[PDB]
mmCIF file of C-alpha atoms and ligand atoms in Angstrom:
data_model
loop_
_atom_site.group_PDB
_atom_site.id
_atom_site.type_symbol
_atom_site.label_atom_id
_atom_site.label_comp_id
_atom_site.label_asym_id
_atom_site.label_seq_id
_atom_site.Cartn_x
_atom_site.Cartn_y
_atom_site.Cartn_z
ATOM 1 C CA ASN U 93 13.237 -11.356 -15.776
ATOM 2 C CA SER U 94 9.626 -12.464 -15.155
ATOM 3 C CA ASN U 95 7.208 -12.159 -18.155
ATOM 4 C CA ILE U 96 4.294 -10.866 -16.057
ATOM 5 C CA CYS U 97 3.910 -7.716 -13.883
ATOM 6 C CA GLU U 98 4.671 -8.447 -10.274
ATOM 7 C CA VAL U 99 1.642 -6.434 -9.013
ATOM 8 C CA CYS U 100 -1.249 -7.295 -11.408
ATOM 9 C CA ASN U 101 0.137 -10.613 -12.803
ATOM 10 C CA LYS U 102 -0.627 -9.610 -16.441
ATOM 11 C CA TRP U 103 1.691 -9.350 -19.450
ATOM 12 C CA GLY U 104 1.984 -6.159 -21.466
ATOM 13 C CA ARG U 105 4.545 -3.313 -21.704
ATOM 14 C CA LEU U 106 6.844 -4.292 -18.817
ATOM 15 C CA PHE U 107 9.925 -2.581 -17.327
ATOM 16 C CA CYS U 108 12.429 -4.999 -15.914
ATOM 17 C CA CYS U 109 14.399 -4.610 -12.691
ATOM 18 C CA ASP U 110 18.191 -4.670 -13.165
ATOM 19 C CA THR U 111 18.939 -6.080 -9.757
ATOM 20 C CA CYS U 112 16.257 -8.754 -9.418
ATOM 21 C CA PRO U 113 14.021 -10.749 -11.791
ATOM 22 C CA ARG U 114 10.749 -8.795 -11.257
ATOM 23 C CA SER U 115 8.960 -6.808 -13.892
ATOM 24 C CA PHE U 116 6.325 -4.028 -13.796
ATOM 25 C CA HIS U 117 3.845 -2.144 -15.728
ATOM 26 C CA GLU U 118 4.740 1.546 -15.665
ATOM 27 C CA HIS U 119 1.857 2.605 -13.309
ATOM 28 C CA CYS U 120 1.775 -0.668 -11.331
ATOM 29 C CA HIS U 121 5.200 0.106 -9.814
ATOM 30 C CA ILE U 122 5.074 2.743 -7.082
ATOM 31 C CA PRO U 123 6.541 5.258 -7.664
ATOM 32 C CA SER U 124 5.728 5.011 -11.488
ATOM 33 C CA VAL U 125 8.729 3.440 -13.309
ATOM 34 C CA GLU U 126 11.356 6.156 -13.731
ATOM 35 C CA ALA U 127 11.977 7.526 -17.336
ATOM 36 C CA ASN U 128 15.704 6.861 -17.547
ATOM 37 C CA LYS U 129 18.108 5.372 -14.881
ATOM 38 C CA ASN U 130 20.193 2.476 -16.238
ATOM 39 C CA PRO U 131 20.548 0.347 -14.255
ATOM 40 C CA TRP U 132 17.045 0.594 -12.683
ATOM 41 C CA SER U 133 16.295 -0.998 -9.339
ATOM 42 C CA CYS U 134 12.637 -1.717 -8.299
ATOM 43 C CA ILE U 135 11.072 -0.868 -4.955
ATOM 44 C CA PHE U 136 11.609 -4.392 -3.648
ATOM 45 C CA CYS U 137 15.356 -4.001 -4.269
ATOM 46 C CA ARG U 138 15.439 -0.503 -2.752
ATOM 47 C CA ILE U 139 13.713 -1.742 0.416
ATOM 48 C CA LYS U 140 16.179 -4.655 0.722
ATOM 49 C CA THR U 141 19.103 -2.190 0.457
ATOM 50 C CA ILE U 142 17.757 -0.129 3.416
ATOM 51 C CA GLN U 143 17.671 -3.266 5.537
ATOM 52 C CA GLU U 144 21.194 -4.331 4.435
ATOM 53 C CA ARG U 145 22.671 -0.890 5.139
ATOM 54 C CA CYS U 146 21.138 -0.877 8.671
ATOM 55 C CA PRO U 147 20.524 -4.426 9.947
ATOM 56 C CA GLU U 148 19.304 -3.050 13.292
ATOM 57 C CA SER U 149 16.346 -1.466 11.441
ATOM 58 C CA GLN U 150 14.758 -4.947 11.676
ATOM 59 C CA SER U 151 14.711 -4.972 15.473
ATOM 60 C CA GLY U 152 11.185 -4.626 16.908
ATOM 61 C CA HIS U 153 9.446 -1.244 17.049
ATOM 62 C CA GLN U 154 6.358 0.088 18.729
ATOM 63 C CA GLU U 155 3.599 1.168 16.306
ATOM 64 C CA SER U 156 3.123 4.416 18.173
ATOM 65 C CA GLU U 157 6.727 5.450 17.479
ATOM 66 C CA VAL U 158 6.469 4.361 13.800
ATOM 67 C CA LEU U 159 3.349 6.443 13.231
ATOM 68 C CA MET U 160 4.974 9.644 14.548
ATOM 69 C CA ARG U 161 7.926 9.385 12.149
ATOM 70 C CA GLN U 162 8.275 12.194 9.695
ATOM 71 C CA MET U 163 8.001 11.249 6.041
ATOM 72 C CA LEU U 164 11.701 11.516 5.194
ATOM 73 C CA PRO U 165 12.877 9.605 2.043
ATOM 74 C CA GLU U 166 13.151 6.200 3.736
ATOM 75 C CA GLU U 167 9.699 6.396 5.368
ATOM 76 C CA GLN U 168 8.210 7.684 2.071
ATOM 77 C CA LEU U 169 9.655 4.618 0.358
ATOM 78 C CA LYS U 170 8.347 2.233 2.983
ATOM 79 C CA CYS U 171 4.813 3.670 2.637
ATOM 80 C CA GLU U 172 5.059 3.397 -1.154
ATOM 81 C CA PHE U 173 6.051 -0.257 -0.820
ATOM 82 C CA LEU U 174 3.258 -0.984 1.683
ATOM 83 C CA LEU U 175 0.746 0.628 -0.765
ATOM 84 C CA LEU U 176 2.219 -1.567 -3.510
ATOM 85 C CA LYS U 177 1.826 -4.722 -1.411
ATOM 86 C CA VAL U 178 -1.905 -3.963 -1.119
ATOM 87 C CA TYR U 179 -2.262 -3.459 -4.913
ATOM 88 C CA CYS U 180 -0.551 -6.837 -5.298
ATOM 89 C CA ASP U 181 -3.697 -8.556 -3.967
ATOM 90 C CA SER U 182 -6.347 -8.947 -6.616
ATOM 91 C CA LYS U 183 -9.070 -7.962 -4.115
ATOM 92 C CA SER U 184 -7.594 -4.460 -4.108
ATOM 93 C CA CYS U 185 -9.732 -3.802 -7.227
ATOM 94 C CA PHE U 186 -12.668 -3.151 -4.953
ATOM 95 C CA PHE U 187 -10.870 -0.314 -3.140
ATOM 96 C CA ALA U 188 -8.814 1.254 -5.976
ATOM 97 C CA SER U 189 -11.133 3.777 -7.521
ATOM 98 C CA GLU U 190 -13.569 6.348 -6.154
ATOM 99 C CA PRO U 191 -16.561 4.606 -4.555
ATOM 100 C CA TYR U 192 -20.217 5.683 -4.469
ATOM 101 C CA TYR U 193 -22.864 4.878 -1.965
ATOM 102 C CA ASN U 194 -26.540 4.143 -2.655
ATOM 103 C CA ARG U 195 -27.800 1.171 -0.672
ATOM 104 C CA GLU U 196 -31.138 0.869 1.121
ATOM 105 C CA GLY U 197 -30.578 1.092 4.854
ATOM 106 C CA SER U 198 -27.056 2.592 4.705
ATOM 107 C CA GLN U 199 -25.611 6.049 4.467
ATOM 108 C CA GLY U 200 -22.239 6.721 2.800
ATOM 109 C CA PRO U 201 -19.120 7.602 4.839
ATOM 110 C CA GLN U 202 -18.351 11.133 5.847
ATOM 111 C CA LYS U 203 -14.869 10.860 4.407
ATOM 112 C CA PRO U 204 -14.578 8.570 1.432
ATOM 113 C CA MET U 205 -11.153 7.127 0.711
ATOM 114 C CA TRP U 206 -9.660 4.876 -1.919
ATOM 115 C CA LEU U 207 -6.253 3.443 -2.991
ATOM 116 C CA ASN U 208 -5.747 5.714 -5.999
ATOM 117 C CA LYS U 209 -6.364 8.765 -3.795
ATOM 118 C CA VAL U 210 -3.656 7.520 -1.353
ATOM 119 C CA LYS U 211 -1.405 6.888 -4.287
ATOM 120 C CA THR U 212 -1.849 10.486 -5.507
ATOM 121 C CA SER U 213 -1.398 11.824 -2.014
ATOM 122 C CA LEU U 214 1.946 10.001 -1.651
ATOM 123 C CA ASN U 215 3.034 11.139 -5.089
ATOM 124 C CA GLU U 216 2.220 14.773 -4.231
ATOM 125 C CA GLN U 217 4.045 14.501 -0.797
ATOM 126 C CA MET U 218 0.863 15.365 1.117
ATOM 127 C CA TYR U 219 1.666 13.235 4.147
ATOM 128 C CA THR U 220 4.100 14.699 6.686
ATOM 129 C CA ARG U 221 4.152 11.679 8.975
ATOM 130 C CA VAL U 222 3.644 7.948 8.621
ATOM 131 C CA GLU U 223 0.432 8.339 10.676
ATOM 132 C CA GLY U 224 -1.244 10.316 7.788
ATOM 133 C CA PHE U 225 -0.745 7.509 5.358
ATOM 134 C CA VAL U 226 -1.754 4.718 7.793
ATOM 135 C CA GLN U 227 -4.900 6.595 8.889
ATOM 136 C CA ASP U 228 -6.131 6.991 5.250
ATOM 137 C CA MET U 229 -5.342 3.317 4.535
ATOM 138 C CA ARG U 230 -7.251 2.083 7.586
ATOM 139 C CA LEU U 231 -10.149 4.467 6.742
ATOM 140 C CA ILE U 232 -10.638 2.694 3.430
ATOM 141 C CA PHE U 233 -11.506 -0.581 5.205
ATOM 142 C CA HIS U 234 -13.370 1.012 8.089
ATOM 143 C CA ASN U 235 -15.702 2.902 5.657
ATOM 144 C CA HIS U 236 -16.327 -0.404 3.832
ATOM 145 C CA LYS U 237 -17.240 -2.274 7.045
ATOM 146 C CA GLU U 238 -19.582 0.394 8.193
ATOM 147 C CA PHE U 239 -21.408 0.794 4.850
ATOM 148 C CA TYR U 240 -21.902 -2.877 4.029
ATOM 149 C CA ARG U 241 -23.159 -3.727 7.562
ATOM 150 C CA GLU U 242 -24.303 -7.334 7.546
ATOM 151 C CA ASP U 243 -23.833 -8.016 3.848
ATOM 152 C CA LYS U 244 -21.267 -10.723 3.340
ATOM 153 C CA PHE U 245 -19.406 -8.247 1.041
ATOM 154 C CA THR U 246 -18.071 -6.699 4.268
ATOM 155 C CA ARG U 247 -15.571 -9.570 4.330
ATOM 156 C CA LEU U 248 -13.623 -8.108 1.392
ATOM 157 C CA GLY U 249 -12.678 -5.175 3.723
ATOM 158 C CA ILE U 250 -11.522 -7.586 6.390
ATOM 159 C CA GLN U 251 -9.468 -9.506 3.943
ATOM 160 C CA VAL U 252 -7.709 -6.592 2.311
ATOM 161 C CA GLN U 253 -7.137 -4.929 5.697
ATOM 162 C CA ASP U 254 -5.406 -8.098 6.905
ATOM 163 C CA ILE U 255 -3.006 -7.850 3.911
ATOM 164 C CA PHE U 256 -2.359 -4.244 4.764
ATOM 165 C CA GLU U 257 -1.722 -4.927 8.478
ATOM 166 C CA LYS U 258 0.569 -7.950 7.946
ATOM 167 C CA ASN U 259 2.643 -5.960 5.490
ATOM 168 C CA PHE U 260 2.695 -2.889 7.804
ATOM 169 C CA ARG U 261 4.076 -5.071 10.640
ATOM 170 C CA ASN U 262 6.712 -6.612 8.272
ATOM 171 C CA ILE U 263 7.880 -3.422 6.506
ATOM 172 C CA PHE U 264 8.130 -1.280 9.602
ATOM 173 C CA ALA U 265 9.472 -4.169 11.764
ATOM 174 C CA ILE U 266 6.761 -3.829 14.400
ATOM 175 C CA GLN U 267 7.629 -5.831 17.581
ATOM 176 C CA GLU U 268 5.986 -9.206 17.509
ATOM 177 C CA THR U 269 3.327 -9.899 20.160
ATOM 178 C CA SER U 270 0.719 -12.509 21.260
HETATM 179 ZN ZN1 ZN L 145 0.696 -4.501 -13.688
HETATM 180 ZN ZN1 ZN L 146 14.228 -5.498 -8.125
HETATM 181 ZN ZN1 ZN L 147 24.049 0.891 10.649
#
């Protein structure tokens, strides 16, 4: 196994996957690393199994159909993995915890949103469709763009949103376009 967490790239108290060489901090893995279960298989492994059991699941999809899917177990897992892929980027630090807004010339968003809040919402099964999860994720970056206006710090929103969108298109096998 790796000697650093796959998500945050730090050492510490790691749990090791039994079916691949990745390791995780307890609360870096999503869902949080399960108490027992020997062998234990990480989210990367579980996602690969879905694809292997149904190879046609990689054929192209329309985003509009993906968003209307109910959050059954497989869609729940895919959203968890997409959330995890965002946390994997170190720039996710800026969007993880509850923000506050006091900048001359700007007003805070009407509906603040942050990664840990999405994490809790997934954990508590608060989303009934994929659309719920994707809307909250995109709201994080949209709030950031609007608040920071012409400050160059707006670019962090652009950057982390691009990670989100690339991973959304990969995980849900969105039909490639020009
Ligand atoms: Zn970690
Ligand atoms: Zn694994
Ligand atoms: Zn099949």
